[PDB]
Amino acid sequence: QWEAGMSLLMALVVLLIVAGNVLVIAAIGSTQRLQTLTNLFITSLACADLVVGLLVVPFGATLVVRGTWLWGSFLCELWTSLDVLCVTASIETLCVIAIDRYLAITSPFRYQSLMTRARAKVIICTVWAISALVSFLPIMMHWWRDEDPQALKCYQDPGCCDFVTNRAYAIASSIISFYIPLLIMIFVALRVYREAKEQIREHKALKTLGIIMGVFTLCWLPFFLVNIVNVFNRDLVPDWLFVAFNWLGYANSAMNPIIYCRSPDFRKAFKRLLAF
Numbered sequence: 001q002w003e004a005g006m007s008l009l010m011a012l013v014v015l016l017i018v019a020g021n022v023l024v025i026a027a028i029g030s031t032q033r034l035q036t037l038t039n040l041f042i043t044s045l046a047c048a049d050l051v052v053g054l055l056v057v058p059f060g061a062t063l064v065v066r067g068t069w070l071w072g073s074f075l076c077e078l079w080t081s082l083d084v085l086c087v088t089a090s091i092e093t094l095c096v097i098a099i100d101r102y103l104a105i106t107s108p109f110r111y112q113s114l115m116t117r118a119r120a121k122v123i124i125c126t127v128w129a130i131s132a133l134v135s136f137l138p139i140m141m142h143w144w145r146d147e148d149p150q151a152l153k154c155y156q157d158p159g160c161c162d163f164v165t166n167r168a169y170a171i172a173s174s175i176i177s178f179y180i181p182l183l184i185m186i187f188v189a190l191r192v193y194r195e196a197k198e199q200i201r202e203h204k205a206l207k208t209l210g211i212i213m214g215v216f217t218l219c220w221l222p223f224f225l226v227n228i229v230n231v232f233n234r235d236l237v238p239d240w241l242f243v244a245f246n247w248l249g250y251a252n253s254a255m256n257p258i259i260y261c262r263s264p265d266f267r268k269a270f271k272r273l274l275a276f
């Protein structure tokens with residue numbers, strides 16, 4: 001009855017994720033002084049994290065603790081698609097924030113005169129449309145099915161919701177959803193770091209964004225490294241370890257609100273907003 005021990009723990013992780021990310025979104029939405037363009041992009045992140053806390057983790061927990069999928073074959077597919085979507089939209093929004101800040105530091109005047117709150121809302125829309133496309137459509141079309149009997153048995157069993165995929169899908173989805181935006185985020189972030197260094201409160205706020213980026217990479221990159229090792233040698237990566245690395249990724253959705261707590265502007269605004 002580690003089954004009940006884990007059930008309660010999982011419900012608290014949900015709470016933390018969901019409450020933290022609601023708090024961030026409520027701070028941004030109730031403080032005019034905190035509605036920078038950047039923070040509009042942060043809104044998108046907190047939303048992806050919020051969908052993780054409300055939909056992805058709760059259904060995931062049930063799989064983890066009971067060891068079977070209870071929610072039918074269609075919700076198995078939908079759950080998986082929304083999980084994959086949240087991760088994709090998160091890393092694409094982080095790579096947009098890296099690029100945005102690189103242009104903000106190298107051309108502050110131009111940038112502030114020609115990005116607006118509406119033009120950001122459009123970028124964000126695009127991101128979620130691309131995310132949804134690369135996530136939902138391949139899953140819906142069953143492009144991810146493998147031909148091995150083990151795989152086929154899982155797909156015919158409504159009670160199996162392991163993302164057992166073919167090699168081609170595993171590689172391609174991982175490149176497109178994660179490895180290329182990660183590589184871009186890192187390349188661009190290092191250039192922002194270079195230019196800041198050349199130039200020397202502004203810099204403390206840039207530091208927070210760097211931390212978010214590094215932490216997101218540490219949380220998700222284990223899973224994505226393992227994803228690739230496993231397409232090459234299926235025996236190499238035990239399932240419980242794969243699952244542990246996936247939960248490290250889910251944990252990222254609890255982390256952002258906590259990191260935002262340490263920005264001084266955000267803190268103040270949370271104090272005000274909460275009758276506190």
Ligand SMILES: CC(C)(C)NC[C@H](O)COc1cccc2c1CC(C#N)=N2
Pocket residue numbers: 079080081083084085087088162163165169170171173174177178227246249
């Ligand atoms: C719902 C499942 C069980 C799937 N969760 C896996 C993880 O949360 C993130 O999943 C992914 C996100 C983006 C791209 C991906 C991916 C798993 C694979 C694969 N091959 N390609």
